[PDB]
Amino acid sequence: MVQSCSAYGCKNRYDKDKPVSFHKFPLTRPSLCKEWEAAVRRKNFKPTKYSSICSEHFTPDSFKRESNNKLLKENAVPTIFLELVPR
DNA sequence: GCTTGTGTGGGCAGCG
DNA sequence: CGCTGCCCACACAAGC
Structure with missing residues (x-):
């Protein structure tokens, strides 16, 4: 989109100049989808x-679908969201 | 190989 | 007024 x-503060709106691609939540991986919520530890969910979502938030x-079978690793959740809090 | 399934991609309304 | 929540079709890979 x-x-x-x-993520929290990642207003990195689709910019082809920047090396990032977009994707959708792991709808086919709900439990795993759910830990993404754990990364969105901010009120402003x-x-x-x-x-x-965009690439930069997870590991290549x-x-x-380029992961294992056809989707991300069920044990992998976007931790690259941020260091802590922007300013 | 072609067709179907899942990933991919962006928007509008209600409340501080 | 801006942000959050949910939806449909096409391309590539797998199956027949």
Whole structure:
């Protein structure tokens, strides 16, 4: 989406100049989808699993269908969201 | 190989 | 007024 990722402060709106791609939540991996919520530890929880997220938040390994079988690693959740808190 | 399934991609309304 | 929550079709890979 061209609004913002499900991360905290990542308003890295789709910019082809920057090396990032977009994707949707692991709808086919609910439990795993759920830990993504654990990464969205902020009150300002962005859109749900229906919205789209960008590459930078996960490891290339877990990027998408290019993972193991056809989706990300069930044991991988976007931790690259941020260091802690922006200013 | 072609067709179907899952990933991919962006928007509008209600409340501080 | 801006942000959060949920939906549909197409391309590539797998199956027949």
